[PDB]
Amino acid sequence: DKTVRWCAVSEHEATKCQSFRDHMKSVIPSDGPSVACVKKASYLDCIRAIAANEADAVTLDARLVYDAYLAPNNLKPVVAEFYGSKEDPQTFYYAVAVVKKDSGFQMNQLRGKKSCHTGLGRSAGWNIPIGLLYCDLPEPRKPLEKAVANFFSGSCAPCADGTDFPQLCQLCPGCGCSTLNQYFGYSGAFKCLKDGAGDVAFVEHSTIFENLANKADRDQYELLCLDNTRKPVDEYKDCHLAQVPSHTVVARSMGGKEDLIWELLNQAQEHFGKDKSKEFQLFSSPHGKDLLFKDSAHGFLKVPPRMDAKMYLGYEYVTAIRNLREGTC
């Protein structure tokens, strides 16, 4: 079944990718799928490499999955992570806004606060919250990056251009687009909040549970609800900004090895999936969180035949894309 060239973003994912490679070769038959690792500096380098036939797969946030579908890359979603549990696999998660208890501000009072984002262009960390805050932003609202920079009093938006928008990297100079940046991703945006650099962290409902084991510590955090009220972090079901599609593995439309990618990940989850093995874990790592796949993931599900990004994401989500692209207030 040959090799799947997985695109790892930076050293931490590269390390996990190597371990993945070795453990698979230890339990998979000689004629079964194998994993090779291609190291890049950002998810964007991964998209291009795949489009260039230099790599075959990379897992992306749903909003980035849409971007990957755009010319000249034209990539397609092939395997989706799922969450929740084995009994009720959910191919979605919730975008939430975590804040410190007693900080004294609601969703409608975010102007002038310091913000922590998982990364520019990602569902929970950017597009969802910024979409809801769009009209509260000072004009001109486009380019978005500049408007967001002016709205907050400094933030960290990984992957954004610090030269054009320095305010977006005040909390994480350079705005690194990988785990090399301590405030990158879900875990990074949360740390940015926990360590006191920012007042709010736009992440997923699972983020605080994935990063803080003690309930006593979690009781010092809250969530900002749409009706301008706050609720405990465990009440995300009825206090979130939006429900968003799973992070998903993308590949080329033609000659993309979608068949081998599924086989690799399906066999991988049977051997090293959630709580499957003590020797290696697909959804965790001593080198960092959310490497290659989200830690909050419980497994994988195959995307229907030839489905493109638009079909996969669903009507609601694509509408919100058009809505943001065509601002209006």
- Can you give the binding site for Fe ion, defined by CB under 5 A? 61, 123
Q: Is 67 annotated as a binding residue?
A: no
Q: Is 236 annotated as a binding residue?
A: no
Spatial contact of 190 and 116, defined as CB atoms under 8 Å apart: yes
Residue 306, annotated ligand binder? no
In the bound state with Fe ion, the residue whose beta carbon lies nearer, of 24 and 97, is 97
Using CA atoms, how far apart are residues 26 and 29, in angstroms rounded to an integer?
A: 8
Q: At closest approach, how far in Å is the CB of 42 from Fe ion?
A: 15
CB of 153 to Fe ion, least distance (A): 25
Residues across the chain = 329
Q: Are 215 and 222 in contact (CB under 8 A)?
A: no
CB of 150 to Fe ion, least distance (A): 25
Closest to Fe ion by CB, 50 or 64 = 64
Which residue, among 133, 202, 131, 117, has the nearest Cα to 168 in the 3D structure?
A: 117
Q: Which residue minimizes CB distance to Fe ion?
A: 61
Rounded-to-integer distance, Cα 224 and Cα 215, Å: 19
> Annotation-wise, does 297 bind a ligand?
no
Structure tokens at 18: 């190597």
Nearer to Fe ion among residue 93 and residue 280 (C-beta) = 93
Least Å from the CB of residue 61 to Fe ion: 4
Report how far residue 228's alpha carbon sits from residue 265's, in angstroms, rounded to the nearest whole number.
41
Cα–Cα distance list, 120 to 57, 124, 128, 182, 229 (Å): 21, 10, 11, 15, 26
- Least CB distance from residue 124 to Fe ion, whole Å? 5
Rg over alpha carbons for the chain, rounded to the nearest Å, is 19
Question: Do the annotations mark residue 122 as ligand-binding?
Answer: yes
Instruction: For Fe ion, give the closer residue by CB, 207 or 281.
Output: 207
User: Binding residue per annotation — 179?
Assistant: no
Query: Rounded to the nearest whole angstrom, what is the least distance from the CB of residue 64 to Fe ion in the complex?
Result: 8
111-123 burial, b if ≥16 CB within 10 A, otherwise e? eebbbbbbbbbbb
Nearer to Fe ion, 10 or 167 (CB): 10
113 in Cβ contact with 152 (< 8 Å): yes
61 a known binding residue? Answer: yes
Indicate the residue among 83 and 151 with the shorter CB distance to Fe ion.
Answer: 83
CA angle 274, 279, 282 (to 5 degrees): 35
Binding residues for Fe(3+): 61, 93, 186, 247
Binding residues: 61, 93, 118, 122, 124-125, 186, 247
Binding residues for hydrogencarbonate: 118, 122, 124-125
